[PDB]
Amino acid sequence: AVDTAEQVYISSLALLKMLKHGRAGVPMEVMGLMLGEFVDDYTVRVIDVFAMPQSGTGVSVEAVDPVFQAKMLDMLKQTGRPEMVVGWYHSHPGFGCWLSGVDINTQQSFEALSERAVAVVVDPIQSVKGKVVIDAFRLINANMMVLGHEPRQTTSNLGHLNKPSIQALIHGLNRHYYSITINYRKNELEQKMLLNLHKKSWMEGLTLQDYSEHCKHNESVVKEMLELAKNYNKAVEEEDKMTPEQLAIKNVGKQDPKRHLEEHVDVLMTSNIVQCLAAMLDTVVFK
Amino acid sequence: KQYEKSENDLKALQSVGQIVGEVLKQLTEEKFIVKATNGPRYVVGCRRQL
Amino acid sequence: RPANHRQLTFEEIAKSAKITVNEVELLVMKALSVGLVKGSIDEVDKRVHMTWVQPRVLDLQQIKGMKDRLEFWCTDVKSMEMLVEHQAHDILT
Amino acid sequence: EFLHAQEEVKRIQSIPLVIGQFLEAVDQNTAIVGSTTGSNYYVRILSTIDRELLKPNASVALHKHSNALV
Amino acid sequence: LLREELQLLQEQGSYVGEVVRAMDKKKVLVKVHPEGKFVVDVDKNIDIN
Amino acid sequence: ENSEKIKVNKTLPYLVSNVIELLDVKCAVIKTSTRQTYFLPVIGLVDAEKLKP
Amino acid sequence: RRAAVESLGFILFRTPEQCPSVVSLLSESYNPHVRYGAAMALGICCAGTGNKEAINLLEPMTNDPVNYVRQGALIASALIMIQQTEITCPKVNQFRQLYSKVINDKHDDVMAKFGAILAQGILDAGGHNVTISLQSRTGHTHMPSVVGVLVF
Amino acid sequence: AVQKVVVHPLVLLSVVDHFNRIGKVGNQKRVVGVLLGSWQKKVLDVSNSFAVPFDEDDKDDSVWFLDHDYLENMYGMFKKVNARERIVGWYHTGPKLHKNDIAINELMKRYCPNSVLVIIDVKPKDLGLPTEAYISVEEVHDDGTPTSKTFEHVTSEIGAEEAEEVGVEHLLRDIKDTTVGTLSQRITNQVHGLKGLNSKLLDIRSYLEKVATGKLPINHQIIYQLQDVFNLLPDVSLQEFVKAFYLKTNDQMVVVYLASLIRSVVALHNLINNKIANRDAEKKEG
Amino acid sequence: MVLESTMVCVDNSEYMRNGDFLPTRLQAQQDAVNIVCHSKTRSNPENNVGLITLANDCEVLTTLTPDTGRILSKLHTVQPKGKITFCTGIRVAHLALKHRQGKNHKMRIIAFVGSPVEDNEKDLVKLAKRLKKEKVNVDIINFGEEEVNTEKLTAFVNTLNGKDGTGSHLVTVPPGPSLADALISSPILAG
Ligand SMILES: [Zn+2]
C-alpha cells in the first residue's frame, strides 16, 4: 500500500527475552507481547519485552488477557518506565519463519488498534552464532489492490529485504507480508561491560586462581597426557612415513585415496599448551 | 450446558495429530534419535519438562 | 625467630622449658596432640622441625613489619609483572 | 571473517536431521547416500566433516529439504 | 567467498538412476532407484555416445 | 460453534482409520489406512462409550 | 565502508591513473558494500577520462549475484563513457546493448535495472552537448559538479 | 550451603536497563531489584530478575521500602508463565554494601530459606570480575558477641546457555584476538599479575588505613589469623625446590623434540608439494 | 470522589495494652480503622489505604491497597508492645506515599498516638517546614495517655499549617472511658 521507509529499532534486553522464552517452550509457538514507543512515521523503537502466559496444549493458539494487560502495565507504571505497546511476537521453531494462518488471523484483529504494530518472529533453532534471526513482518490489505502498493522510500531497505530470504512459500508470502529492516544500537557502557563479562569473566575470580591451577596441572596430570602424546607420535608416525612414499607411488597428487591423514598438528598444539603452561610455572610460583 | 460442552468441542477442534514412534537411543543431552513406525529414522529434540 | 631458618634443636627447648632430655619429646608430642604446633621430629640431632607458628595479636612493631614486608612483596610482584607485560606486550598487541 | 563464516555455515543441523547411510563417494566434496526412505541420492557434502569418519557404511545426518550430507 | 557459497547446499537434491539404453532425438531411458522408468533429457556437457 | 463445525465437517474427504487403543492420561491412538500411526490427546466429536479398539 | 571507499575519487580526482591500480584488489572484496563503493569510486575517478584499466576492472562487476553491486556497475559504466564514441572505448555499443539487455529482461529485479534506465539517461544527457567535469582550464575544481555528483 | 552461584547475562542486562529506568529521576536513588533463579544443587542457578520499589532518604538513614504486594502479584505472573522458575533472592547496584543492606535479606528470609544477594556494578570501571554474591551466616565470636549475623561471599562467574550463547556471541561482533591456543590465555596472563596487584594495593591501603582511622579497627580476629596464614605460606626454600628444575628440563624436553622433529618435517613436506606444483606448472605455463 | 491516598497508622505501642478504653484499646482503634476505611471507601473507591505502625520498627504491613481484606487480616495479632516512634514515622509514611503512582492524589495520613512520645521540638519543626515543602495534610487522632493534656502535638500541628493551611488537624484523646463511636463522632464529620 502506501509505504514509508522501513526501519525497526531494538533494545538489547529484547533479543535475550525473545530467545529465552522462545527456547523454554520450543515445540509450541509461544505468544509474547512487545513494548516500546512509536517515535515517528518510519522508525519504531521497542524498549521492553514481557512474555505472555500459556494455555491449553496446542500449537500457535494465542490470547491477550486484558486483566494481565492492566496488571502488567500497572506494574510497569510503578516501574520506572511506563510506555505504549508496539506489537507482539512468537516463534516458528522448525522452519523458515513465515507467519501462519493463525498469525494473520490475530493480525487482522490486532491491526485495528494500531497501524504499525509490527509482528516479529524469533527463531532459536535456525540461528547458531552468526544469526539473530530477527525476522519481522507487516500485513497488507486486500481493499487496496485496485490501487498500487509501491512507493518504497529509501530503496536500499527492500533490496536488502530480498537477500535474507529463501523459500517457495516465502516467495508465495510476499503477498500479505512485506518485511521491515531491523538494526541494532548498543550502549558503549553496555557494550564495554558485556565485553567486561565476556572477555574478563570467562577468566575466573581473582584471575590468579585458574592459572595457578594450570600450574598444578603441569607437574601432576600433564605427564599422563604426555605419555598419550608420545604414544600417538610414535604410532601415527610409522605409518605416516608411508605417506610421501605412496605420494611418489600413485600419482602427482590425485584424489583422496583413503582414511587417515597426518593429524600431527593438533597433537603438537596440545604440546604447545604443555610448554606455555610450563612457562606459567616460573611466573606464578616465583613471586 | 449444550453451549458449554459444544464450546469445549469448539476449542478442541484445533488439536493436531502427533506421530507415534520409538526411541532408538540417546545421542547427547538434547539430541535424540528415534524411529518412525511407518518408515524412516529421525534425529529429534525434547521438551524442557520431560 | 623470623620463621626462615627455624629448625629448633633439643638444647634451647631444654633451656627455656628447663626440663630434662627424655621429656622434651613428650613436650612436643603433647603440642602435636593438641595441634598448637604443626611440625615434625628428627632425633639424630633431636631437631624438632618447625612448619608452624601461632597467630598473635598485632603490636606496633608488628604493624610496621606487616606494612613493610607487605610492601616488600607488593613492589616485587609489580616490578616483575611490569617486565613480563612489557617484554611480551607487543605480541599481544 | 573466516571463523565467523565457518560458524555461519553451522546453522544447518540444529533439529531436523534425518538419517541416511553412506554408500559411495564420487570424489572430493561429492558423495552418494541412500536414505531410509528407500530411494538413493546424489548429494553434496559439507566441508565440516573429517573424512576419516566415513566410507565403509555410516549412519549419516541429512537435511530434510535439501537432502545433503551434514 | 567459497564458504559464503553456502546457499548452494541449501537448494535441492539430485537422483541416481540406471540407464537401460538410449534412443533417437537426444534422449535416454532411466530406471531411477525404486520407481519405474522415464524418458529424460541430457545436459549440454555429456555425450550421447 | 456451527460455523467451526461447518469449517471442519465440510472438508468432505474423511481419511478412515482404526482405533488402536484408548489411553486415559481420554486419549486415542490411530492407525490410518496409509499405515501411519498417529497420537492424539484430544478425541473430538465421538464418545468414549462408542469407541473400542 | 561504502562511503569510506567512495571517498577515494573525491579526494584523488586530480589524477585518475591512481585509483584503478589501488582498487584493483577491492573490486573483488567479500561483501557487496565494499564492491559497490569500489565500483562507484572507479566511476567517479575515471569519469572524465577514457580509461581502459577502469573498463578492465569494471567489466566483471556486472556479474556479481547481488543486485545493487550490478546497479553500481551500471552507474559507473555510465560514468566511464561521458560523450565517448567508438575510439576512446569499443564498449559504447557493447554497453548500449547491455543496458537494453537488462532493462528489457523481465526476470531481473527493479534495483538491478534501475541503473539501466538511469545510465541511458546519463549517456544521452543534454543531447550529448554537455558533459560532466571536475576540472577546468584554470586548474580550480568545479564546485557544483563535485557537490552534485557527491550528493547524488 | 552454596557451592557457587551461576549468573547469566540476562539478569545483568536486566540491571543495566533498570538503571536506565530510574536514571531520569536521578536525584538520590540506588538500583535495587529482586532476583530469580533455581536451586539446582550445592551450585546455584540464576535465570531471570525484575524490579522493586525502593527509596532511602538522608535523615535517620534506615528508611527502606520493600513492597510485599508487588512481589506477590508479579511473582504470581512469573510463576504463572513459568513453573520451573521460582525465587532465590535479591540484588542491588552495589557500589559496596552499606549498613542498611541486611534488612532486605532479613525481610525476605521468609520467602527463600537462604535468600542470596548479588552485588554488581553498572559502571564498568571495575577491572575485576563483577557480580559479587554474598550469603548471610552467623559466626558467634569468642568475645561473647550474642549473634554476629554477617554476609559472606560465595564465588561467582558468568555461566552459559545455548540460546544466550547465540544472543551474546552475536551481540558482540567486536573483538576476537584469541585464535584459541598458546595465546588465548596470555592477555589473561597479564591480567592475573595485574589483578593480583590491584587486590594487593587494596590490601596495603587497608593496612595503612586501619592504623590511622577506625579508631583501632584493625579486624581484631581475622587480621592476626589470616596474616599469619600469609606469613606461614611463602615457600622460597632452596633444598629441592631447586630440584624441580630437571622436571622443568623434562617439561622443556618433550616439546623441544616434538617441535624440532615434526614441525620442520611438516613444513618441509609442504615445501615439497609447493615446489612440485610450482615447477610442474611452470613448465606448462612458460 | 475526592483524590487522596489515606495512610492509616496503627497504634501497637505498649501503653495500648490496657483496658481503660472500652474492651481493649486495640479493638476500639480497630473498629476506628473499619469506620475510616469504609468512610474513605464511600468517599472514593479510587483512593486506596495501606497501614503502617509506630512499633519497634515502622513496618509496612500492607501496601497501599483499595481492598480492606488485608486490613482486616493485619488488624489482628498486631503485637501491641513497643516504644512509640513518631519523628521518623512522618518520614516513613511520606516516602511510602512517594512510592505511590498517582501523585495528584493527596498525601493524607492519619496518626494514632496513645503513648508518651520523646520527640524533640526542633525535629518536629524540621518536619513542619518539611511537610510545608512537601504538600501533606495529616489529621492526628490521639489515643490513650501521654504527658497528659498532650504536648508537642499541639506544637506540631500548630507549626504544621500556619498561614492558610486548614488541612491538618489534631484530634486529641478524650481522657474518659467512652464509646469509640463517640471518639470518632467529631472526626466522622470533618477534620
Ligand atoms: Zn506462527
Instruction: Please provide the DSSP assignment of B3-34 as one string.
Output: HHHHHHHHHHTT---EE-EEEEEE-SSS-EEE
**Cα distances (angstroms) measured from residue G133 to each of E27, G16, G45, G140, H27:** 60, 13, 11, 11, 60
Q: Which amino acid is at A147?
A: L
Whether residue C27 contacts residue C16, with contact meaning beta carbons closer than 8 Å, is answered with: no
Q: How far is CA A81 from CA A73, H55, H156, I95, I101, in A?
A: 10, 16, 30, 19, 12
Contact with chain D for residue B33, Cβ under 8 A: yes
First-to-last alpha carbon distance for chain C, in angstroms, is 48
Amino acid at G3: A
Q: Are strands D59-62 and E18-19 parallel, antiparallel or unpaired?
A: unpaired
Structure-block grid coordinates of residue C28: 612436643
Provide CB contacts within 8 A for H98, sequence distance 6+: none
* Geometric angle at alpha carbon G138, from G135 and G141, rounded to 5°: 35
Strand partners, A44: A8
- Write the DSSP assignment of F12-36 as a string of letters: -----EEEEEEE---EEEEEETT--
Asked if A181 reaches chain H (Cβ–Cβ under 8 Å), the answer is no
Contact H13 A16 (CB under 8 A): yes
The closest alpha carbon to A137, from A100, A96, A98, belongs to A98
Q: Name all contacts of A140-144 with Cβ < 8 Å and 24+ positions apart.
A: A140/A1, A140/A175, A140/A176, A140/A177, A140/A178, A141/A1, A144/A1
Return d(Cα A244, Cα A234) in angstroms, integer.
Answer: 17
CA–CA distance from I112 to each of G38, I8, I12, I31 (Å)? 81, 8, 9, 13
Kindly state the cell numbers that stand for A238: 610409522
Asked if H64 reaches chain I (Cβ–Cβ under 8 Å), the answer is: no
The answer to whether I101 contacts chain A (CB < 8 Å) is: yes
* Helix, strand, coil fractions of chain G, as percent rounded to 5: 60, 0, 40
**Residues of C whose CB is below 8 A from A283:** 84
Cα dihedral angle (I35, I39, I41, I44), rounded to 10 degrees?
-160
Checking DSSP bridges between strand C48-49 and strand H134-138, what pairing results, if any?
unpaired
- CB-based contact H89:H112 (threshold 8 Å): yes
Cβ-based neighbours of H233, under 8 Å, separated by 6 or more: none
Cα C82 to Cα A210, G101, G148, H200: the distances in Å are: 21, 67, 56, 15
What is the number of other CB atoms lying within 10 angstroms of the CB of residue A120? 22
Nearest to H68 by CA among H83, H48, H54, H85: H54
Tell me which method was used to determine the 3D structure: cryo-EM
Give H75's contacts in chain I (Cβ within 8 Å).
none
A56 with B16: Cβ contact below 8 A: no
Question: 3-state class of G121 per DSSP?
Answer: helix
Contacts of B38 in chain F (CB under 8 A): 34-37
Judged on CB neighbours under 10 Å (0-12, 13-18, 19+), I131 is buried
Return d(Cα I71, Cα I143) in angstroms, integer.
Answer: 20
Give me C92's grid cell.
Answer: 599481544
Q: Which three cell numbers stand for residue I118?
A: 520523646
Among D residues 22-61, those touching chain E with beta carbons less than 8 Å apart: 32, 34, 38-44, 46-47
The span from the CA of I50 to the CA of G27, in Å, is 72
Residue numbers in the known binding site of A are: 90, 92, 103
Q: Read off the amino acid at residue G60.
A: P
Helix (H) or strand (E) holding H201: helix H186-212
Instruction: Choose the closest CB to A255 out of D4, D16, D27.
Output: D27
Residue of B nearest to F32 (CA): B38
Taking CB atoms and an 8 Å cutoff, what residues of chain D touch A169? none
Separation CA G39–CA A5 (nearest Å): 26
3-state secondary structure of D5: helix
* Euclidean distance between CA atoms G44 and G59, whole angstroms: 16
User: Which stretches of chain E are assigned E, i.e. beta strand?
Assistant: 18-19, 27-31, 37-41
Look at strands D41-43 and D59-62 and give their pairing.
Answer: unpaired
Q: Which residue has the cell 563417494?
A: D25
Rounded to 10 degrees, what is the CA torsion of H261, H264, H266, H269? Answer: -120
Helices within H213-263 (DSSP H only): 224-230, 245-258
Give F38's contacts in chain B (Cβ within 8 Å).
17-20
CA count, 13 A, side-chain hemisphere, C4: 4
Amino acid in the structure at residue H235: D
H or E, element range at A86? strand A84-91
Locate cell 585464535: which residue?
A: H179
Query: Sign of dihedral through CA atoms A154, A156, A158, A160?
Result: negative
Rounded distance, CA E2 to CA B9, Å? 55
Q: How many residues does chain H have?
A: 286
Distance of CA H11 to the CA centre of its chain: 14
Helix, strand, coil fractions of chain C, as percent rounded to 5: 55, 5, 40
Across chain E, which distance is largest between two alpha carbons, in Å?
42
Q: Is G97 exposed, middle or buried (0-12, 13-18, 19+ CB in 10 A)?
A: exposed
- Residue A181 alpha carbon to ligand 1 centre in Å: 20
Question: Cα angle at D38 between D34 and D41, to 5 degrees?
Answer: 35
Residues near A47 by beta carbon (within 8 Å), at least 6 away in sequence: A11, A14, A35, A36, A37, A81, A83
Choose, out of I91, I100, I124, the residue to mutate when testing the contact with H (most H CBs < 10 Å).
I91
A125: chain D residues, CB-CB within 8 Å:
14-15
G109: burial class by Cβ within 10 Å (0-12, 13-18, 19+)?
Answer: middle
Contact G78, G42 (CB under 8 A): no
Measure CA E38 to chain center: 11
A260 Rama sector, left if φ>0, alpha if ψ -120 to 50, beta otherwise: beta
**Experimental structure resolution, Å:** 3.6
Residue I159, CA distances (Å) to A204, I86, I170, I191 in order: 60, 16, 12, 17
Q: Which of I12, I20, I4 is nearest to I80 (CA)?
A: I12
Q: How many of the other CB atoms lie within 10 Å of CB of C43? A: 9
In angstroms, the Cα distances linking H149 to H63, H117, H133, H222 are: 20, 15, 16, 16
Chain D positions contacting chain A at CB under 8 Å are 4, 7-8, 10-11, 14-16, 27-28, 51-52, 55
CA of A183 to the centre of ligand 1 (A): 22
Q: Establish whether the linkage from the previous residue to A133 is cis, with ω within 30° of 0.
A: yes
All residues of chain F having their beta carbon less than 8 Å from the beta carbon of residue B35 are none
DSSP E strand stretches across A198-273: none
Interface check for I63 against chain H (CB to CB < 8 A): the answer is: yes
Ligand 1 center to residue B44 CA distance, Å? 20
E interface with D, Cβ–Cβ < 8 A, is 3-4, 6, 8-16, 32-35
Distance (Å, whole) CA C66 – CA H221: 15
- Measure in Å the smallest separation between the Cα of I100 and chain H Cα atoms: 10
Q: Per the CB < 8 Å rule, is A287 touching C84?
A: no
Option in I65, I92, I95 nearest H69 (CB): I65
C-alpha G132/C-alpha G138 separation (Å) is 16
Where does residue G72 rank: exposed (0-12), middle (13-18), buried (19+ CB within 10 A)? buried
Mutate to test the interface with D, among B28, B41, B46, B47 (most CBs of D within 10 A): B41
Q: Which three cell numbers stand for residue I154?
A: 499541639
Residue type present at position I158:
N
Q: Is H92 left (phi over 0), alpha (psi -120 to 50) or beta?
A: beta
Establish if B24 touches chain A: CB-CB under 8 angstroms: no
CA proximity to H8, closest of H52, H31, H38: H38
Q: How many CA atoms lie within 13 A of C85 on its CB side?
A: 15
Sheet with E37-41: list strands edge to edge.
E18-19, E27-31, E37-41
DSSP annotation of H132 reads: B
Q: Quickly list DSSP for I105-174.
A: SBEEEEEEE-S-----HHHHHHHHHHHHTTTEEEEEEE-S-SSSS--SHHHHHHHHSTTTT-S--EEPPP
Euclidean distance between CA atoms C84 and C81, whole angstroms: 5
**Cα separation of G19 and G13, whole Å?**
9
* Interface mutation vs chain B, best among F39, F46, F47, most B CBs within 10 Å: F39
Check D55 against A259: CB less than 8 A apart. Answer: yes
Q: For residue A86, give every residue at least 6 positions away whose Cβ sits within 8 Å of its Cβ, in sequence order, or none.
A: A34, A35, A36, A37, A38, A44, A45, A46, A114, A117, A118
Instruction: Please state whether beta strands H5-7 and H156-158 pair in parallel, antiparallel, or not at all (unpaired).
Output: parallel
Dihedral of the alpha carbons of G23, G28, G33, G36, in degrees to the nearest 10 = 60
Mapped onto helix, strand or coil, the DSSP state of residue I50 is coil
Cell numbers 528489457 correspond to G104
Q: Which residues of A are annotated as a binding site for Zn(2+)?
A: 90, 92, 103
| C-alpha cell of residue A172 | 508465495
Calpha distance A28→A50 (Å, rounded): 18
Candidates B7, B13, B14, partner chain A, best to mutate (most A CBs within 10 A): B14
Buried b (16+ CB within 10 A) or exposed e, A129-159: bbbbbbbbbbbeeeeeeeeeeeebeeeebbb
- Three-state DSSP class for residue H158: strand
CA G43 to chain CA centroid, Å, is 3
Q: Is B41 on the interface with D (CB under 8 A)?
A: yes
**Closest by Cα among I133, I115, I113 to I125:** I133
What span, in angstroms and rounded, lies between the C-alpha atoms of C11 and C8? Answer: 8
Backbone phi, then psi, for H84, in 5-degree steps? -65, -35
Distance CA G115, CA G76 (A): 9
* Whole-number Å distance between alpha carbons of H218 and C57: 10
Please give the C-alpha separations between residue G94 and each of G43, G89, G90, G123, in angstroms, as whole numbers.
17, 10, 7, 13
DSSP alpha helix (H) spans, H145-185: 162-171
| Beta-strand pair I136-142/I107-113 | parallel
The alpha carbon dihedral of G109, G112, G113, G115 has a sign of positive
Chain I CA closest to residue H72: I63
For residue A63, which residues of chain B lie inside 8 Å, CB to CB? none
Nearest to H14 by CA among H44, H47, H39: H47
Angle between helices H186-212 and C60-87 (to 10 degrees): 160
CB contact under 8 A, G111 and A163: no
A159 interaction partners in chain G (CB closer than 8 Å): 67-68, 109, 111
Q: Do I and D make contact, counting contact as 3+ CB pairs within 8 angstroms?
A: no
Is I155:I185 a contact under the CB 8 Å cutoff?
no
Give me the phi and psi of G138, to 5 degrees please.
Answer: -80, 0
Map residue H44 onto helix, strand or coil: strand
Spatial distance between the Cα atoms of E21 and D69, rounded to a whole number of angstroms: 31
The residue of chain H with its CA nearest to that of I52 is H65
- Distances from the Cα of I77 to the Cαs of F30, G124, I15, I89, in angstroms? 61, 96, 16, 21
